[PDB]
Amino acid sequence: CGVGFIAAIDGKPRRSVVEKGIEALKAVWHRGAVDADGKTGDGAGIHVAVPQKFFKDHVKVIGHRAPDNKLAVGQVFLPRISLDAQEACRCIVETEILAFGYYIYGWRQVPINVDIIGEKANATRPEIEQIIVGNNKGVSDEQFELDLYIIRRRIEKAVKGEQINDFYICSLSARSIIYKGMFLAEQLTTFYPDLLDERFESDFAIYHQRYSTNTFPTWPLAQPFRMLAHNGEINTVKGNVNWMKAHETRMEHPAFGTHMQDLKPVIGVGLSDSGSLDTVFEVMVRAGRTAPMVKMMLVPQALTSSQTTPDNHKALIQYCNSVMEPWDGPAALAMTDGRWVVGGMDRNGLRPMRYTITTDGLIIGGSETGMVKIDETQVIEKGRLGPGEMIAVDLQSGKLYRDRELKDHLATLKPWDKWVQNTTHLDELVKTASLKGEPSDMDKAELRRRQQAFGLTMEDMELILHPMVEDGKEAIGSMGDDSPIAVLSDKYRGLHHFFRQNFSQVTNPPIDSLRERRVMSLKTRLGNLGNILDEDETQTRLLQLESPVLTTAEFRAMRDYMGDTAAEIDATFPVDGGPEALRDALRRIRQETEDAVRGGATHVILTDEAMGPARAAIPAILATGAVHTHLIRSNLRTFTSLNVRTAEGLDTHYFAVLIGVGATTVNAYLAQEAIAERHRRGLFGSMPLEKGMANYKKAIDDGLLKIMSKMGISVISSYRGGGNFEAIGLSRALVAEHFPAMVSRISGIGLNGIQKKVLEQHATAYNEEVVALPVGGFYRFRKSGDRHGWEGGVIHTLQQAVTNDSYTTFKKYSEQVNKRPPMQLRDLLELRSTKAPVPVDEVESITAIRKRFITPGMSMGALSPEAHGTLNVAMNRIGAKSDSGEGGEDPARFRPDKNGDNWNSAIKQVASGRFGVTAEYLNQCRELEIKVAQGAKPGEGGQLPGFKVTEMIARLRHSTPGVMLISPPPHHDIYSIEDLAQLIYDLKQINPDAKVTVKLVSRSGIGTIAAGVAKANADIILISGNSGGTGASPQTSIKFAGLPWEMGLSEVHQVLTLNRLRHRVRLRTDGGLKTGRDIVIAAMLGAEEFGIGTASLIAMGCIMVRQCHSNTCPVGVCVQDDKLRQKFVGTPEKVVNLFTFLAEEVREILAGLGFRSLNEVIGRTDLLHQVSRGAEHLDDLDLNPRLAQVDPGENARYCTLQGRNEVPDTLDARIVADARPLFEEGEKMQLAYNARNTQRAIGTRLSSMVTRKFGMFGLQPGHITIRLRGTAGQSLGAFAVQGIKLEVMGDANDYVGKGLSGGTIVVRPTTSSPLETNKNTIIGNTVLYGATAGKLFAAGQAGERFAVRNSGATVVVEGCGSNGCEYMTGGTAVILGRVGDNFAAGMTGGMAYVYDLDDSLPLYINDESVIFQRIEVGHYESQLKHLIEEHVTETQSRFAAEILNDWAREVTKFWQVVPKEMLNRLEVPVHL
Amino acid sequence: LNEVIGRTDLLHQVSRGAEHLDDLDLNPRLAQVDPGENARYCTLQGRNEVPDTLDARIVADARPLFEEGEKMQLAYNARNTQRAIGTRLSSMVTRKFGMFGLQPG
Amino acid sequence: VESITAIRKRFITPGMSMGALSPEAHGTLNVAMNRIGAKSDSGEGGEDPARFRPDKNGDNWNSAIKQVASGRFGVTAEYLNQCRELEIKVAQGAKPGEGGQLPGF
């Protein structure tokens, strides 16, 4: 994959611009899935100017006369198999161009060579044809495209009405034309020779290859699109899409004249995310806005409220943000309206984008940098884009604008501020009334009874509400979610329970809402929905909150300011009502809001307030959706704000759902109440009820910001109404009828059930007195109502069983377990088969089976050292495997002990904060598990409370003692699937023997990703259930993120099968598997391996008391405390017994089924039948979609060979060859080689080899040194141990020294480059990610997230993008230059100095955990000096040398950045 | 000639004469289906052949007829699935005795 | 074109004896050549066997091609075995008809 762009700064056309454009496209394949087929690829494209010589001649050769104007071309994909349709297609195409009365010189079959296409693709190949049009009407450049635009839509539309498939017009303008198709980019020129003609000349270029979650090639989905080309993904798409359904309700501009209606819907079916973007971007530009304005209105930069930003810009930004809600997601963009050409970034700089400027007056935009030869000699600059920036060219004036200067320009266009000043911030007005006193008007006798209506409890009040009020933070907890899944529940659960928060896995990264809160946002606006098409100050006239969240005080504040303008709808219904009560209720509300809005109303207030003994409340969630949708469905939502008052609301989740299913504003009124009551028994102590709410509110605000970040979304306006949930349990019909689009893969209950349950709980609370809520056993087993998997009896019996070693006791446990009411989906399945039973002896053996079992990754830290190694011993004893876990593994452990026991773990993880990740760690295993996610907390990343960060722990992890370890939610080197792809490459490079796994978490859509993972060379894929365990994690994720494995595991099984990849990868699953049958059923759904954690913990003794986060483990399982660790009685022997039983119980089952082995039953879903009905009312689920087979009946067999999906060599292949002496004799060596952007992970293999023979540190620095001219591609020197040194004279791309491990890497411009070392980029992003040792020197600037997570590498570099030194925990980080926003966020431990010539660092640095001072003590001043010296010595850097020359005056200019938590720890204090 | 069959790339449409621009689209006539390098086929030979019927046994059961001139009675079952029964017999008979050389029956 | 790594490997540093040259010069050469995967030549006069291992720094003083010349200087079962190539020296262009000299001092 890649996007790129090239432009002649002067405006004047040239052939090189195209030849370069090709040139690029020939250097991106190293980033894609190569087929063994040699031909097949996902899509490539080049968007250049229609070449009028070339075309005109053509018209001449047929013997017409060339017009004076520009001649248009339509580039069109016609149906290729039904001639009947091609015609219809061409009549339509002609008719439409005809009624604008332009002129047709006529069709031209494009030459192409289909030999380089694969069949898959030739299959879906359309018939590519050009049609040539002339501007007989003598209109203007601008009018021609305008008209053509209305024409293309007209066609587009008619073909649709005709119901014609496969028709598609890539381009149709007289300025630009697009040559895209499904073929390898390196072969664009081959599939389309026109491109090789010298008449193809152009002032600009835009190329783009693409990847996918598929095996299927659609042609129209290859880019570049008509104005756009996008690298990344736009996670905020459904959000955007539904907004346009309303934005459109009002869009009207005069340029389209009477055409608008043909103009809508601007977004047709079947578009890829980027495709939809181009769609919007286009209309906007067709109506007048420049390119750069549009990048902004749609992919605006973050308005951090800071000095970093001039005030013009801020105005503008604020303007946009008020018109259009962003289109978020990682995004490198290459854009152009007719005149300008733009390179742009998303608001988080999520994708690479280097660029070079030449003496010849060209700018070449890129994704990597070595992408197209240019002589250093003619380089005038070497830049990049950072979050939010753009760079551009105005081709009419042949002027280049860098970000500042370009943004300057746009600020210039209008009185942004004067206009912005037109908004009413009703904030202060609202805060005022709060301080004036958050009221409360119910008597406990009430609170209690309503509360009972929504089935609330003490656990609810104590466990969850309280901490919010107190700490202003939400409840953290531990252990998995073992309760039933709500539909199956026995006990009133509220709608919000069935909506699961979505989150993101490999497609895009989730953000850090702590360390990166400045880019996020919760602004809310009522009435800012008018004409995205307009550009007038009247667009700022709207009210603005700063949180959709309102305390009963603030709420009324607002509701008053509104007034005649608001309308209140009664979200409630009679109980005397009848079977259809709630239905008609839902109609009613729907209608009433209609009338209101029509009637003139501008704000709606939906509410349960009139709930009483005679009226049940309509589930706020359902009521909000029913309303918002119908509002959209009638083009009305654009006229109001929709505000909800809810008695049932209480936690963060409930807000999130409400908001994103419509809600503008929410007020949890009966909870502020419940807060008060608590407060008048002084449960909060001294603290005023007002400060009370304040906190509550922050907890819910950060609440949301988080839930959002789980699918990288930075901003509530795009999130709102986007329906980002997945419904488990409610009926298809329903979810469709009333909420935005969401999946509900098995219908579930419907209104009639909902009604019945709502009312039942109701009687509970108005049928008689209520002094206390029940206790509740949702977050914990009480011997009360809610059941759980793990309950006391069950735990005892199991313990009894593995301790006394009786299989009979085991069997009694599992029976205890299997005889209950259904609690989980698998519980609803029976296993029946058609074979007679077989004798048990005959089945496969335990030895055999237990080997398919593994003990999941549970970190050293989360668990006691004793527990951890216990597990490693058990697994190795039975020839199985265990998983180190998120947090290091002690290397002493790399040998078997006198007793023969083996503490080393067989599968090592690799997770966001790269904990103990070392060349030697990565090499002490058979398998690497890339942890993208756990079912306990999908969107997010580990926690390890500070008081667990023992010293041993801290030593392991290179973290700082007793300081907390919260991990970055996303991996920093996996922002998109190609990214995954490359990590897997490095992984397979540093360790030639291991298989690589990807931990993913079930959720709908996993299937597809699963595929991409497969194309990315992963060997195993593991789908984790929503219910798995965690040692520490917020409770909403434990109860609301994730989906059951029975759904995700089949989806992966299916989809992978459906694309013929299912044999390329092995499948594993975990999530609550405690029993023989749980394991058989998982096999039949497709699994080959099963993970067993918690139950293995319980055998080691866990009693499931849930204080894993607390460091108070009654039993030594999950606690670092010494005394407490002495109460541990786990034993290998115990765990081994657990597995032994499990397998035997598996064999017992297979025999009954007639199979003599597990393999004979994988995928065999025909052996499972869904029985269970388990409720009073006819409310059933559809378990089909899970049981279905893709290619039922006999399967063909693809031979799979034993081993791992192998990978292509790199430079290391030769380097190693050339190093015989090294390994053979010990010699020292110096090698030289060139290097291209296309060579990845250079050295890594070397390193693996060296680490293996001499170990990370048995070689003295520089022992083997390899100079490289040119460009290093991603992962340069990744995991290099000491002894290796790489000099890259030239430059590099992302991830230099990723996981650096005591090796050394240096990078400087070519002796001959005339560039000013420090005023130019030289290495990409996420450099030194997670390093632990070694040095890195860089004559130049580095890009975003430099030194992220560095845990002990020393570096020197002349500058650095934003988010630098983030989450750093060790090492020294010098920095000869300016530094990006948010520097040092979360930087708990190492040190960075920072030459700052403008005393600006103050404006950029992230205070929170760090401080800066000028050097005072002189050993710190000396430390710096020596590095800088080294730097120079290695890099021959002038600018550096000079700082050395004036040390005296200069030292004065730096700034010591030192972590708070390091102040008292530091041998030599930092101060005098 | 072979080197050029189907090669429409060798024909361009100039259609000119004296009138108003009212032109035809001769493209649909000229387009290639799978343009660009062709596979090479060897000379396919003979005729699309077809399945035997009962006649392939009657003839076998009839050696004496064709070899010695004998007169024969053959018995067989027949199904709606067997077509043109007798026609190949006829061909053989016609060729060796002509349509009228053998006495009826 | 082919790479330097590749090409430089076709280069070698001739045999110049320990004696004719300083010990420092001699081993310098052996180190250079082994560093770039090429070959050096011991020369007419022995090679010290200590030199038969790479040193703490990774440098390798041992020479890859050992000579064998008239006065068999250091010619030993172990010398002959510490290499990839044996060079029978029948003659040098400086003095074809003749054979080395090493002044007594």
Ligand SMILES: Cc1cc2nc3c(=O)[nH]c(=O)nc-3n(C[C@H](O)[C@H](O)[C@H](O)COP(=O)(O)O)c2cc1C
């Ligand atoms: C205490 C504990 C620690 C865990 N630590 C990690 C970890 O370090 N890395 C990880 O990728 N998943 C971790 N997990 C999840 C497990 O690896 C596995 O996905 C899940 O534990 C199994 O769920 P089950 O508990 O119902 O047996 C942890 C889970 C628990 C309960």
Ligand SMILES: Cc1cc2nc3c(=O)[nH]c(=O)nc-3n(C[C@H](O)[C@H](O)[C@H](O)COP(=O)(O)O)c2cc1C
């Ligand atoms: C100082 C010196 C020492 C030499 N010693 C030997 C030697 O020991 N054995 C040998 O076979 N040739 C010897 N030669 C010759 C070289 O091995 C090689 O044949 C010739 O040096 C290369 O000539 P060129 O000097 O113009 O580079 C010696 C030459 C020189 C200059």
Ligand SMILES: CS(=O)(=O)CC[C@H](N)C(=O)O
């Ligand atoms: C190379 S790419 O993975 O960024 C593809 C971009 C986009 N989401 C698409 O589906 O086309």
Ligand SMILES: O=C(O)CCC(=O)C(=O)O
């Ligand atoms: O130990 C750690 O860093 C993480 C452990 C963890 O996140 C979990 O077990 O839920």
Ligand code: F3S
């Ligand atoms: S608190 Fe974790 S619950 Fe198990 S580990 Fe101790 S009993």
